[PDB]
Design a protein around this ligand. Sequence first.
Ligand SMILES: Nc1ncnc2c1ncn2[C@H]1C[C@H](O)[C@@H](COP(=O)(O)OP(=O)(O)OP(=O)(O)O)O1
Ligand SMILES: [Ca+2]
Ligand SMILES: [Ca+2]
Length: 511
Amino acid sequence: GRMSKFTWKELIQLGSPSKAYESSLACIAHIDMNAFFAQVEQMRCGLSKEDPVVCVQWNSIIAVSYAARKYGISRMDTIQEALKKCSNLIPIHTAVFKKGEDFWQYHDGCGSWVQDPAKQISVEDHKVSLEPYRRESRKALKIFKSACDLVERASIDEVFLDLGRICFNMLMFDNEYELTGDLKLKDALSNIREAFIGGNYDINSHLPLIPEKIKSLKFEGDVFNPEGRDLITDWDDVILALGSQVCKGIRDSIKDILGYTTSCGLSSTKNVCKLASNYKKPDAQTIVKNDCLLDFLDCGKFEITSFWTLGGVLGKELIDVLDLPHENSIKHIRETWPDNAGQLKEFLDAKVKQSDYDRSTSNIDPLKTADLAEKLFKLSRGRYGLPLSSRPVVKSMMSNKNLRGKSCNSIVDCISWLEVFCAELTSRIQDLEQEYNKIVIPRTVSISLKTKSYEVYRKSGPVAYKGINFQSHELLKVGIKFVTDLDIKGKNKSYYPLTKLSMTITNFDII
DNA sequence: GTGGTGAGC
DNA sequence: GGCTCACCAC
Ligand SMILES: Nc1ncnc2c1ncn2[C@H]1C[C@H](O)[C@@H](COP(=O)(O)OP(=O)(O)OP(=O)(O)O)O1
Ligand SMILES: [Ca+2]
Ligand SMILES: [Ca+2]
């Protein structure tokens, strides 16, 4: 009291696209798109945001627009089953390649749920394509990178944002933003701003108490506040508010430029953000103040298994290692180690060396048992700041096809599928160039296949480039050769009908 | 060198 | 239930 809890160092740190995730005064934001594949379709067919449109594949649903969710339809339903829940459902099948053609297409009006035995899309001579969804994913991304200097791509429909710089700059140099009638930020934060340029301060001096006037700063979106704590008490709250503001803008552009609704979570931790974004859907924005982190993590919807990269199996074990009750398990980890990370550290040691398990089926690395420590201890409190980072360069790319029926008998059929693969792969190589804005070419190509008896033939080798920058053809040129040798490699053995053909590319070069 | 199979879109 | 992708014991 009598002075803010955060120091200048922690504030100024928001302007560093490298040491920003530390401050705790951080302001990260996660954004996921609602019923994505459902939407990009809901958009492509000029339908409305409120039409029970579902995205199907063969006989299974893979995306359910929220309009059609109101009828109880979910992912664990089959087009057939779903229609009995809502006869006005608008099922739309993804685009697909046809055995033999080097281009995918949209067979609208067609689908297994169609009576006409001619408007069917057999899974025998067709392969689902996801370019459309990738094509859109990037757009949204481009729209992001234009509003945020540091953007991490979580997955095809998710992205994290480091609203550090934008918040700091707004908090210091924005002479436009208005709080209400006649009251701009330039007057409400005069004290903090005048002090900033003054430089008269030690980077360790606790910032001044937030000006009484700033409390009239409104948050944008639902502020998780069950206990009803005050909205703006310290700076981290002020920065977060400014974030929600900015964040709303970004999310509005997407909706206007592409027309995609999204859920969004704001907090000082990517992890905590990941949760908040999924807390409410669709088209909403949850906000978890640092002084609500515990109230949020214990609202009664999360567990130690709901934590990204900790809910597959390592999470399962964690329970069998710390007893971890089957409910209020997160809080339990907090109230059992109110010491520090160091405490739980040893507990891990004196819980592994004995007669409980074997280092043959445990994802818990003994030596680095200090990491797993601080991790759980931090997560439990909602303070595990992970720096945003780019996904490591791709190592490979597979264009498979689990064949069925007696389709694949001759080599002209394999060749017929190799064209397809060659297309899809010459479609993910381009999307990669655009992402790293660097030219990419695969120096090696292999072709695997499963015979009738389910055996495995595979030939791998280099790819000759008769020029300097092609692919879509020379890839099939070689691909074929292999598919031939293998054919000869099994003339009088269990071969056709094949049960799985597939082309893979590795040994990439990023010039 | 991988197929087994855990993780995730 | 489907389709892709990174690893790493046997
Ligand atoms: N079981 C599955 N089968 C096929 N595709 C899936 C499956 N699970 C996820 N996907 C992929 C295809 C979808 O376009 C994409 C959607 O992103 P996801 O994060 O799963 O949520 P969603 O967009 O379907 O709904 P939400 O609004 O809850 O985010 O995930
Ligand atoms: Ca989603
Ligand atoms: Ca997702």
